[PDB]
C-alpha cells in the first residue's frame, strides 16, 4: 500500500451517459522514481523514498546531487517516503507509474491547504459573532469570554483563539477514483482535495475502505 506523489492540476467535471456530473480533481502523477530503499537491518523500518518531476541542475545542491547519483536517477523536485507493507519489494531506480492505482477504488489525498494567514475566531473556529446593534460596544467579532474567574485563574491550553489558519498538512479520505489515465499521467478523483493549483499531493490507497 504505497502511494504516489502528484501535482494538483485543477478541478473540472465529468459527465456520465446516465446524466450525472461528477466533480473531479485532476492530479498529474508523473513517474515516481525510487531513490532509496530502507529496510529493517539498516534503517529499522521498511520504506521507499521516491522522487517526481524534474529540477534544474543549477538549483540542485551537491549533497542532493550525490544522493540522486547513488540511485542513478534524475533529480526530481522533492523527496518523499512511503512505508512498505509486508510483501512489497521495490528496487532503487525503479519507476512507478500511475497505473499502480488501476484497480484501487478509493484513495486518501494529502496536501497542504491554502493559507488564510492570521484568522479571527469567527473564521478559524466558527465562533458566533456578537450583536451587530443593541448597544454592542466595539465587540462585534471579538472572542467573548476566555475563562472563568479565580478558581481556574488562568486560560486552559487548547483554548480556541485567533492565529494562523491554513497552510498546513491536511488529508481528505476515501475519495472515489473516477479515472486512471496512464497515457497522460492523470488521476481523476471525485471531490476537492486540499491545496491550491500546482501544489504537491500524496495519493495513497484508502486506509479505511
Amino acid at each position: 500500500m504505497i502511494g504516489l506523489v502528484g501535482k494538483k492540476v485543477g478541478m473540472t467535471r465529468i459527465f456520465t451517459e446516465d446524466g450525472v456530473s461528477i466533480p473531479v480533481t485532476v492530479i498529474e502523477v508523473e513517474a515516481n522514481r525510487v531513490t532509496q530503499v530502507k529496510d529493517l537491518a539498516n534503517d529499522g523500518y521498511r520504506a521507499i523514498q521516491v522522487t517526481t518531476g524534474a529540477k534544474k541542475a543549477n538549483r540542485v545542491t551537491k549533497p542532493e546531487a550525490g544522493h540522486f547519483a547513488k540511485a542513478g536517477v534524475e533529480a526530481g523536485r522533492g523527496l518523499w517516503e512511503f512505508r512498505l507493507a509486508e510483501g512489497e519489494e521495490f528496487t532503487v531506480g525503479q519507476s512507478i507509474s500511475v497505473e499502480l492505482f488501476a484497480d484501487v477504488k478509493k484513495v486518501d489525498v494529502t496536501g497542504t491547504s491554502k493559507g488564510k494567514g492570521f484568522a479571527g475566531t469567527v473564521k478559524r473556529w466558527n465562533f458566533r459573532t456578537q450583536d451587530a446593534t443593541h448597544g454592542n460596544s466595539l465587540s462585534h467579532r471579538v472572542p467573548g469570554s476566555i475563562g472563568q474567574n479565580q478558581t481556574p485563574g488562568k486560560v486552559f491550553k487548547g483554548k480556541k483563539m485567533a492565529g494562523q489558519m491554513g497552510n498546513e498538512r491536511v488529508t481528505v479520505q476515501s475519495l472515489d477514483v473516477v479515472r486512471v489515465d496512464a497515457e497522460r499521467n492523470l488521476l481523476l478523483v471525485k471531490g476537492a482535495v486540499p491545496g491550491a493549483t500546482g501544489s504537491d499531493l500524496i495519493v495513497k490507497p484508502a486506509v479505511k475502505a
Binding site: 467535471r13 459527465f15 446524466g19 450525472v20 456530473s21
Partner: protein, 122 residues
C-alpha cells in the same frame, strides 16, 4: 430554503391561501426545508367555507421554492414563489384534492405519489 416564520403560498384546494412555517420537522436544530420536506405550518389566511380554517396547526410538504432544487448534472429549477401542499396532521396524507402549479420530481416517492398524480406539470 424554508425556515420558521416563512410565509408560503398553498398549491392545493384545502382552502388555505397563505400559511406560515412554525417548525421545520426532521431532526434536532434542523434549519431549512427544501422541496419534499414536511413542515409544521399555521393557517394565516383561508377562503370562507373551506376545508381548513385560519389558526389551524397542521403539517405541509414543500413543493416549490425560490431556492429551487439542483439536479445530478448541476442544473437548477427555481420557482417564483414558495408553495406547499397541506397534509393531515396525523396521517400525513394530503387533505386537498387538486394540486395547482408545477411540482418537481423530488416528490416522486411512496409518500407523495398522490401529489405527483394530481399535479398539472412535473
Amino acid at each position: 430554503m424554508i425556515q420558521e416564520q416563512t410565509m408560503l403560498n398553498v398549491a392545493d384546494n384545502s382552502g388555505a391561501r397563505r400559511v406560515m412555517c412554525i417548525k421545520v420537522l426532521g431532526g434536532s436544530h434542523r434549519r431549512y426545508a427544501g422541496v419534499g420536506d414536511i413542515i409544521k405550518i399555521t393557517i394565516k389566511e383561508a377562503i370562507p367555507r373551506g376545508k381548513v380554517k385560519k389558526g389551524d396547526v397542521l403539517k405541509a410538504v414543500v413543493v416549490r421554492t425560490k431556492k429551487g432544487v439542483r439536479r445530478p448534472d448541476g442544473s437548477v429549477i427555481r420557482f417564483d414563489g414558495n408553495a406547499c401542499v397541506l397534509l393531515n396532521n396525523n396521517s400525513e396524507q394530503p387533505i386537498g384534492t387538486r394540486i395547482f402549479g408545477p411540482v418537481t420530481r423530488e416528490l416522486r416517492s411512496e409518500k407523495f405519489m398522490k401529489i405527483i398524480s394530481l399535479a398539472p406539470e412535473v
